[PDB]
Amino acid sequence: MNKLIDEITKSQLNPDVPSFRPGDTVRVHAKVVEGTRERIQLFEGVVIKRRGAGISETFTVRKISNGVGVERTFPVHTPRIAKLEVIRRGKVRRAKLYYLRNLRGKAARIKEI
Amino acid sequence: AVPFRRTSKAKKRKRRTHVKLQLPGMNECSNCGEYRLSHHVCPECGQYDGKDV
Amino acid sequence: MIQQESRMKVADNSGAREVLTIKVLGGSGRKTANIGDVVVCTVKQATPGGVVKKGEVVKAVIVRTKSGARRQDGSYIKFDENACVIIRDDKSPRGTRIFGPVARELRENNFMKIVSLAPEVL
Amino acid sequence: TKGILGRKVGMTQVFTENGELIPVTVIEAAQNVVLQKKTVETDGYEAVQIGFEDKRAKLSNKPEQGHVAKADTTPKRFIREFRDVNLDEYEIGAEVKVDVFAEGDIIDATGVSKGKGFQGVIKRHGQSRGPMAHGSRYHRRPGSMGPVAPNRVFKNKLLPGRMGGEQITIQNLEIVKVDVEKNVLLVKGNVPGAKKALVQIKTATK
C-alpha cells in the first residue's frame, strides 16, 4: 500500500476487463506470436485463483486438454489479452480452488448460480 | 577450557574497570522540594505533573 | 526442475513407457533441466513389441513439466505431469506420433518436427 | 556525468510498448540544491556538494545553517559529494531536477544495505551444513580453523558477526521513465536499502 505508486501506475490499468470471481468459466483471447505472424489463441477454463492489488494482480485459469490438466497464469491488466468473456458463473465456497488439482472428471464439476 | 595460569592482581583489577554501576538519574521535586526520579511519580508527596495521584 | 534419478513418462509412439534421468547436458556443474532441455536417460519400463527396449540408454527432450516456464509477457504455464519424447542424434523423434499437450517453447529450440505432430502446442 | 539524491519509495511493475512486463523501483528526488563547489586551487580535487531534503529549523544547529546560508537555502538533511563532474555547470544555489536524466540512460545506484544482526556462517558467508542425521553432531558450525603448523589461525577466517548495513553499488541499471512534475525516477530492477532509504543515482562509470 502506497499512494505515490498508485498514482504513477494508473494510466496502465485496463478499463475493459469484466468482473469475475474464482469459480466461473472464462474464455481468454490471447495474442500469440509466431515466427512472423500475429494470431489469437483461445484458452477456456475455470478460474482457480485471483491474487494481488492494483497493477500487480494476476489470475489463473485451468483446463484439461488431451487428458492432461493445464494451468495458465495471466496479469489482469496485460495488453496481450484481446478480450475476456465470462461464459457461466459457478457456485463455490472458497477463494482458492486448489482442491481441483487432485480431482478428475464428474468430481471436479462446478455447480451454477 | 581450564586456566593455564593464575590471574595476577593487576590483570584482575584492569578487567573490573567497567564493572561499576552508574549514578541514578534523580531530580528535585517541584512541590515538596526533594529528590525523585525523572518521569516518575514522587514517592513522598505523591504527585506527578503538579497533580496528586 | 529435473535432475539425476528423476522419472518422467514418455509421450510418443516409441516402445519406451517410463524413463529415469541419468545426466543433464549443458555444463560441468549443471544440475537442473526444464522445458526444452535434452537429457541422457535410461528405459525402465517398455511396452512389448516396441522399437525401444528396456534397459537402453537414449537421449530425450522435455516437453512438459509440473513447474513450467514463464514468458517475457509476464505470463506463466504449468502442467500436471512431467513428460518426455525420445529423440535421435538430430532433433527428430524416434516415434511416429505425440500424445498430450506440448509447450510452445520447443518452437524456439528448433524442435520443429515434434511441434508439428503434437495435438496441441500450448 | 550527472547525479541526484533520492529516497527509495517502493517497487512496482510497468508494461512496455512490446507488452513486456518489467520490475521497476520508484525514487523520489525533490528539493535538490547545489551547496558548495570544490576545486583544485583550494582543495586539490574537484567535486560538487548537494543537499537533498530540508528539515525544520529546530533539528538544525548553528554551524549547519551558516553553511547553507551561503547558498541562500533552508538547512538540508542529506549532504553528499559527486566527483568526475563538469564544474562549468552547477551554479551555487541552483536546483537539481530529475530532468538531467532521460529514458534509456544507464546509471549506478549507491546505497546502504538492509540490516541483519548477529548472523552465522552459513547465512552470512553461504557455507554448507554438516549432516543432520547418521549420528552427526555438526550442523551449523564454521569449520576447521586451520592446520596445526602455524600454531595460530590466519586472517580472513570467516566467522559470525554483524551482517548487513554496508554500502553497495549496483552497476548498469536502466531508466524506464522520468516524471518531472512528481519528481519521480523509475529505475528497472533493484537498489540496495530498505524503504525511505537514501539512494545516490549517478551516471554509469563504464
Place this chain on the structure above:
Amino acid sequence: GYRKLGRTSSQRKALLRDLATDLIVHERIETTEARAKEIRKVVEKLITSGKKGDLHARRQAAAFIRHEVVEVVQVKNRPVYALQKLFDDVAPRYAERQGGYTRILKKGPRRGDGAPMVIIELV
C-alpha cells in the same frame, strides 16, 4: 508487531483477558511496565465495542471479558457482571472523547526482582 511476555500463545491470551477485566472492574491496577503497555491496546479496543451498543458488538466483547461479578445490587438482590458495567457504565463516560481512555504513571522498581512497576488507570 506485538511483544511476547515470556509465555506461550495460550498463557498470553489468558493473561490479557484477566488484566483487561480487572481494569474495567477496579479502574486502577498495579502491573509491570511491559505488561501494561500491552493491555493499553486490548482495553481501548474494548471500550470502542461498548460505544457501539449493538448486539453484534456485545456478543463480540463477550468473547473476551471474563464472567465475574463487579458488585451486587438489590434492584431483588441481583448481581452485576463486568460485561454489563462496560456497556452501561464505563462506555457512556467516554461518549465524546475519541481515543486514549487510559494513562500510565511510573512508580519505581519492585523489591523482589527489580521489576519496574507502573499505574495504569481508566481515565
Place this chain on the structure above:
RNA sequence: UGGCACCUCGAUGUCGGCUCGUCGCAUCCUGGGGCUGUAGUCGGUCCCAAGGGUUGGGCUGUUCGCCCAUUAAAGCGGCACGCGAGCUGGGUUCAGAACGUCGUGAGACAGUUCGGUCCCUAUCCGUCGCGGGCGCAGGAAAUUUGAGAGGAGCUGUCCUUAGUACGAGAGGACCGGGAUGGACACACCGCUGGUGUACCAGUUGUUCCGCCAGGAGCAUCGCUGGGUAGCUAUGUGUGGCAGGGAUAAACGCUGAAAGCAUCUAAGCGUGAAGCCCCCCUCAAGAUGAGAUUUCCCAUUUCUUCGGAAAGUAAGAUCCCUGAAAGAUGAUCAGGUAGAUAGGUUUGGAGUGGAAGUGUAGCGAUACAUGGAGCGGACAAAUACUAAUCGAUCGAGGACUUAACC
C-alpha cells in the same frame, strides 16, 4: 619402501569420509611462443605463465582402482600422510561367540565372521564483530583526500566473415564481429513459490457461560482449507565490459667488437588469462594523528612562577516515545518549535457471505436483507493518551623563526 634410535611412555589419539581452507610448480584447462616426418581440421615436443577454474554416480571401510554419463579440464604434491578441547566411527587395536589351520593342553593366527560407553562451563595468545578512554597545543557540527589493505579475476555453444584460405577428394580454417548459456558473487521481494502460534473460515469429542440461539477452555496451533507485514530461493535485477603503462618466453631495426656476419656492447620497436593501473569496499590511532566549509568567543576568583577552580557560549548528554537499527552499548527517527509510539476515523491486502429477522421445507438445510461481517505487523489524517518538570558535561587557546605586522 627403508637405515638410525635424537624429543615424547607423571599419555604427542592412530585409516577413510564431512565442514573450512591455504601454499609450491615438476601446468590438467584457458593465455603467449620456438621446432615439427607442421597441406587444412587434429596432433607430438619444448619454453614463459600459479589469475581463475578443475563433475555426478555403481562396487568396496576403504586411500587406490575399474566401470557408467558428462566436461574447456576432470593436475601432481606440502601443511603432525592439514584439520576428532570442529563432526562421524564403517576399518584398526579391549572383554562374548563361531569357522579353517596350529597345539596333548590352557590357547593362538597378524586368516575370516556377527556384536561392541568417543569426557571438558575457554584463563592467555590467535580469528570474527561491537563499545568505552585518552590522544591529535582552544571548544564544536558536517563534507572529504587516500599512505595502506581486502574483494573480483573462470569459461562453453550458435550465427556471420566462409563452404572463403588449404586440399585431387574426403574434409575444412587463422584474424575479426554479433547473440546466448554453465558455475560463481552482490542486492532485492513487484512477479512464481515457502513460512507466517494475537488474520479469516469449516469441523470432531468433552467441560463451561443457568437453558435455546451465539460463544469460550482443553485435545501437537486439536485437525483441515487459505493467507498480511517481516524473513526468504528454487524467484527477479546486475557483475567479471571495453581498456592503459612496463614486462616474461619470443620476433625484429640500426650496429661494431671481429672490413663480412650478428636482436647487443651503446641506441630503438613489438610482445601474455600474468605485474602495476582501470572496477567494488574499508581506511588519519597514516602518534607522519592530514584538508575544506561553518559556529562560539577572549569571563570571574585565586596562586610566588609552571598553573589551578567555577559559572558559561557554540554543542552534546542524563531521562522519556520508538525502528528503517539492535545480544548489550552503538546507529537512526522524535520529545509540545510535536505525528515518535498507542488509541480514533477513513482505507488496503486476506478471508470469504457475520449476528438478528424473514421466507421455503416434516427435517437436515437453502435463499434474502448484503462482496456482508471480521480484519497482528500495511497507508493517510487526527494531539485524544504518553514523550511533563528538570539536571549534568562542555572554550578563553605554550614557545622560536620566517613574508607583512
